[PDB]
């Protein structure tokens, strides 16, 4: 280890012997190249957000209106970016946010296994979506020794919800993330224009196809056996659609907590009283997010919500995503009080240009830049990166 | 002299006899032409900043949000733009900020000697970087009668730091600037993309190559004699890299002050309590700067910091750089309470289009415009240019 | 596979069930997307040609000035596009031309194996370069039952030449292609500008590092043994450079024919007298080419040479490459008398966007269009497609 | 220097140790960058041609319509590009054509000395214009051991003409070039638009101001003596204008040959009957040119004239310029029978980006490409490169 910023030294070292980089170095170049390297349906699905995309863009723009105050003569020559979350020490305050189509962002069709392997090699935890090409058991093996988390899309069948949760616990996941802001799909003009919706073609349904409860219920509905389902998952895509999206209730959350020992983390919280109610009810983690503006175009940047969610959450850890594009953004969200920050769009582009090694380069680039900003600007660890280190800017 | 604004009269005078200008007249045209006139590696290194460059750009944008209030019927027909700093009278409240690769911005490879000669001819002080092609002794001779300042990059070897400081004092430098915000290098995507890092190819290492301490220590490490080092400085580039960047401490600053009679000026201060602590400890000068946003992309414009640094510094002089592009910006930073303002990017472009005469044209153009704004808007000297002469603007 | 044109029916069939294509369908879109999907050094090497690239462009433009005359009421409802070459029946009159960096055009770094697998699945013969990441023995296995050809870069060392030739025969290759137009590298501004030359970094040298003659001669030269060479091929990159480019003579061709039973095919012939002298010498095939304009910018389109080379070659087969981009170009070169047509740039783009499946899509797209043109315009087989089916066009 | 093409090996060699090129490698990039690096008046003068510039463009376009036929198995592993002209052996069949404002294309204002030094280092002969900042005596010294030629602008004063001719002989020049197509200046919209005409400002008149005949005649005309003239050459700009342009006659050429031992070379010949009459007169060289289309926009490409001028000139050497941009063009003009080819616009750009080293890079780049084309395409020397090696192309 010594420090995440050391990553730039190998890049410069290789140039001295005539070995040029092969992947881009900034989000802008990641996005521009990766968008052209993808099939058109995958590009539409990944780049696209809800409505006219103002929220998706405003999430990113929010980071331009905070500045870190540099502190001189601090000699922050060794940084400690580790964080302890629900009993596990993370090597970095950053994680791969769940992406249901990441498998298709890689040319080999296994971008989800690629992400888990990148997590094994880097120490950056992976959160698998419920939607995936590799089963959650295989993903957890690919993540090696790195803490791994399971994101539940709570289905409209409690036996299936319990089966997923049980499977995640047995597979060794370190926590359960329940996504609250996508139980129906928002208006997404780019996908609508070409009527693009991959899961209805039977893609990324492996966690259902491999589930005993889903197999039995689909067989009762259709007569189709588990082997036929595995050979053509699209046979069950309409059945999947019928049970995909339960609208979760507070009572559901109480029931989930009572059937698992995993810590439960609620994803999509923006209002501080929702954070307050959740923490007062025993929820282990708050994950402040608006799903990258992909599911509703209501206009409120996710970052605008983070300080009051942090206040309301007290000592309950708060995760943050929606709008992170560079290591500067990582540092700003951490200074606002997020315990760790999730990466979405950037690592989908990584997958498109280089599979597992591309994802890793994205993660190492983001952490290198965050660590170097902390070094230069005089913040030696995350405990010292407090909210009074920021200033609002024009 | 009479006044810096007189420079425009020779430009218009020459047009009357059919002699057109040969160099550009505005920063935009300096930048656009100079960028094309440079080798690609030098362009990447000079234009590039840290991360997505938001800080580098916000430094410049800050100046658009202050307006000088014009005062009529003041008859400011003679301006006094002189300033007295640590016992020396500067003819202008402006200086060339240190640029470690300025030598390579000129086609002849001696852009640093060119800058010093431009300083000799104009009265605009030159601050030599520690990184340079001409030794600090030669630079000081080229600066003629103009006050000249030495910028130290404090190395990870106290014998070498003392050798540099001693050499600067003996050579007749008027002050020592210690840069605090670049002891490790920030994430710089343009340079990373092409793995561009000139000093590791042995460029601009002349102050080390000519130093007795560095020669002896490198010879102990490598067996290489001082003549071989001079003939191929790249032999020592890895050794240079190993000692380049000491992370300076408050105690280091106390030690530096005790071994030199030069005034000591701290470069990179942004936080007012860092200014306060420095002034209370006997530091002679505060140099408010964020290194043009080149080393950390934390988002806080340098100008946003200047008023509170000025308040905290009391009667200790405050220098300012990061974002100055025209004479209007010079006047605004001076009205905020900087004693003098440093020029970076603009004079690198000057060097690229015209060597020493290009650098001089940049300096004379900036001062002409500042002096004419003061004349027209009714401010006859710098004492009258106070912070209440500005207004915030949209 | 009744006819190559049937490939379009699967594409349309799938859209009727809501499955959109994922790869582009025209050369212009292959090129546009693939160029963005590649690392910058591979893009420069693959897209770039010699000089100002007029020859590379003129090769392509030449196909715009020949038009096929449509014949109605011919009921070409079954097409025979097969060709018998040196005793083997090709299912298509088309092959993958040798590309020494094809390995690096795919993200997994094994685009050469990927090409051989696409050849195994399509029946379109692959010609491996002497430069490769997989050994020629491994490539031949990957090509399955499809005829495969070995392209020799004749080295400045006859023992090594004989080893390569013997290995290819033993490995089961069906012919030996000797490239006559790259024993020295032509002026290539795009590569020169970034000083990009992959082989000197020890890339794609596997056929040398696995060769017993090369191992012994390099071990004699440097001291390093076979394992140190397999572990760091760059140790031998300078040695490779010294022997890579023997300027072949007529006497060498005589000698080559005497040590192999394989048919010998000369690549790079443009002048009819060269083709006539080769055939009189008992050379088995003439491969009309100008290396895509990548080695010399002399300005003569390859297609302009093809009719006279065909005429001078008598009953000896003529292969043709340099400027093929679509299936229309394939039909025009066959009509001028090529027995089979080589594909270069287009399948590099295929590798970049889809590995082996992308290469396969390029090949099946070209053949589908050529087959459909023949069907619609009334040419039932390659015998009926002759130079008098063509007209010059403005 | 075994062959000119070896220049590419240094460029690639340096990239292997992380040293990137600093100058462009193609004419398109030389032109693009140099045009931005120049003062606007020099750009207008250098880039601009006569009228709507169709002739200047058509000169260049003509090279796109000739293609060199590649010859295989010629083993041209050693090339002889030397040429013997009027008793001197040139190492290259290429020279720097006269450029009367070349001094001002370099930033230091001495681009003419810089060209002569590049000639001294490369062996590519320099032809100095009568218009220059360095005296013809100083230029000849700067050219070292390389043959040098003096281009006469024959003045309306035979005493002055005789002085110039005598000075060039005494100074050691190897030939006298008489330019026949600029005794009056053609319509040049780019210069007219900004009324740009440098010589009338007293620029580049050193050969007149240092001439004893000019000094006496001007002193008689105006009253000012030699020192007042050396100190302000613009005093004599109107007088220079009055005598600059004598329209040369056949009788003048007879007279010139009688007063010098130097070979006499006529520049601007396009019509075969003019070449035939000159050779019959005992003129030593024919210099086929249309002044780059800079003086008259009549629309005939210079290259279109070259074959018939060669044929009419018998065994008298023919030089050629007007439209050469790359080494491919150099090969094509030599193949049509030019004994040597002149370079204009390209080395002005070289001066603008790099002074003498930039000029040298342009020259070595052109020759490297020409040499490599000859090697790859099978032409061992200039004798083997004849007009039947070429084909017309669309
Ligand atoms: C293509 C794509 C698919 C996604 N699928 C999921 C998912 O399956 N489950 C989930 O909780 N969030 C999903 N998200 C939301 C991400 O977890 C995260 O909240 C979001 O990407 C952050 O916004 P940003 O990418 O704009 O920074 C997805 C995001 C993207 C880009
Ligand atoms: C190419 C370049 C190199 C620099 N090298 C140095 C240096 O050697 N030492 C130093 O203290 N600052 C260095 N700086 C920072 C400048 O002193 C100054 O703070 C900065 O240029 C102001 O930002 P601006 O150019 O955006 O206005 C350099 C600046 C540039 C543009
Ligand atoms: C990137 C690249 C590398 C090449 N490598 C080789 C090689 O190793 N051996 C060879 O005989 N020809 C080589 N060629 C030339 C090709 O076999 C073929 O002649 C050329 O690609 C045809 O021109 P086109 O691609 O413009 O249609 C290469 C071509 C490309 C694009
Ligand atoms: C800026 C410039 C000035 C010129 N000056 C002269 C000159 O003093 N004497 C002369 O004989 N030709 C002169 N020429 C013509 C050149 O010698 C040569 O014929 C022309 O540049 C060739 O055309 P090209 O540059 O378009 O290839 C000049 C050319 C240029 C570009």
mmCIF file of C-alpha atoms and ligand atoms in Angstrom, chain A residues 45-46 56 59-60 97-101 129-131 151 153 179 181-182 267 287 289-294 321-325 342-346 348, ligand 1:
data_model
loop_
_atom_site.group_PDB
_atom_site.id
_atom_site.type_symbol
_atom_site.label_atom_id
_atom_site.label_comp_id
_atom_site.label_asym_id
_atom_site.label_seq_id
_atom_site.Cartn_x
_atom_site.Cartn_y
_atom_site.Cartn_z
ATOM 1 C CA UNK A 45 -29.326 2.454 -21.270
ATOM 2 C CA UNK A 46 -26.158 3.492 -19.445
ATOM 3 C CA UNK A 56 -28.540 13.633 -13.724
ATOM 4 C CA UNK A 59 -25.950 15.964 -9.533
ATOM 5 C CA UNK A 60 -22.564 16.412 -11.232
ATOM 6 C CA UNK A 97 -22.262 1.136 -6.730
ATOM 7 C CA UNK A 98 -24.702 -1.520 -8.010
ATOM 8 C CA UNK A 99 -25.208 -1.586 -11.783
ATOM 9 C CA UNK A 100 -27.699 -4.117 -13.117
ATOM 10 C CA UNK A 101 -26.311 -4.107 -16.677
ATOM 11 C CA UNK A 129 -27.183 -5.665 -8.117
ATOM 12 C CA UNK A 130 -29.938 -8.233 -7.946
ATOM 13 C CA UNK A 131 -29.818 -7.981 -11.748
ATOM 14 C CA UNK A 151 -28.189 -4.918 -3.362
ATOM 15 C CA UNK A 153 -34.522 -5.296 -5.537
ATOM 16 C CA UNK A 179 -32.934 0.087 -3.082
ATOM 17 C CA UNK A 181 -36.327 4.415 -5.511
ATOM 18 C CA UNK A 182 -36.911 1.928 -8.335
ATOM 19 C CA UNK A 267 -30.475 3.278 -0.608
ATOM 20 C CA UNK A 287 -27.196 5.401 1.576
ATOM 21 C CA UNK A 289 -28.574 8.649 -3.468
ATOM 22 C CA UNK A 290 -31.036 9.640 -6.153
ATOM 23 C CA UNK A 291 -30.061 6.774 -8.466
ATOM 24 C CA UNK A 292 -27.986 9.120 -10.656
ATOM 25 C CA UNK A 293 -31.139 10.897 -11.740
ATOM 26 C CA UNK A 294 -32.006 7.853 -13.838
ATOM 27 C CA UNK A 321 -23.574 8.300 -4.580
ATOM 28 C CA UNK A 322 -25.006 10.176 -7.627
ATOM 29 C CA UNK A 323 -22.703 12.513 -9.529
ATOM 30 C CA UNK A 324 -19.179 11.349 -8.536
ATOM 31 C CA UNK A 325 -16.874 11.716 -11.563
ATOM 32 C CA UNK A 342 -20.072 4.989 -4.476
ATOM 33 C CA UNK A 343 -18.942 5.031 -8.106
ATOM 34 C CA UNK A 344 -21.438 4.457 -10.906
ATOM 35 C CA UNK A 345 -21.074 5.788 -14.485
ATOM 36 C CA UNK A 346 -17.235 5.982 -14.381
ATOM 37 C CA UNK A 348 -19.211 1.289 -16.592
HETATM 38 C C1 LIG E 1 -26.498 1.566 -16.128
HETATM 39 C C2 LIG E 1 -26.841 1.674 -14.672
HETATM 40 C C3 LIG E 1 -27.616 0.673 -14.057
HETATM 41 C C4 LIG E 1 -27.919 0.740 -12.721
HETATM 42 N N1 LIG E 1 -28.589 -0.310 -12.073
HETATM 43 C C5 LIG E 1 -28.723 -0.254 -10.736
HETATM 44 C C6 LIG E 1 -29.157 -1.428 -9.917
HETATM 45 O O1 LIG E 1 -29.300 -2.536 -10.541
HETATM 46 N N2 LIG E 1 -29.466 -1.287 -8.654
HETATM 47 C C7 LIG E 1 -29.363 -0.087 -7.993
HETATM 48 O O2 LIG E 1 -29.601 0.013 -6.774
HETATM 49 N N3 LIG E 1 -28.914 1.062 -8.665
HETATM 50 C C8 LIG E 1 -28.596 1.002 -9.973
HETATM 51 N N4 LIG E 1 -27.949 2.086 -10.658
HETATM 52 C C9 LIG E 1 -27.724 3.271 -9.873
HETATM 53 C C10 LIG E 1 -26.338 3.289 -9.279
HETATM 54 O O3 LIG E 1 -26.252 2.383 -8.164
HETATM 55 C C11 LIG E 1 -25.996 4.658 -8.688
HETATM 56 O O4 LIG E 1 -26.932 5.098 -7.730
HETATM 57 C C12 LIG E 1 -25.836 5.705 -9.800
HETATM 58 O O5 LIG E 1 -25.143 5.206 -10.927
HETATM 59 C C13 LIG E 1 -25.062 6.990 -9.301
HETATM 60 O O6 LIG E 1 -25.248 7.995 -10.341
HETATM 61 P P1 LIG E 1 -24.018 8.376 -11.313
HETATM 62 O O7 LIG E 1 -23.684 7.142 -12.074
HETATM 63 O O8 LIG E 1 -24.689 9.437 -12.164
HETATM 64 O O9 LIG E 1 -22.936 8.905 -10.474
HETATM 65 C C14 LIG E 1 -27.502 1.903 -11.930
HETATM 66 C C15 LIG E 1 -26.720 2.936 -12.518
HETATM 67 C C16 LIG E 1 -26.410 2.844 -13.852
HETATM 68 C C17 LIG E 1 -25.513 3.905 -14.494
#
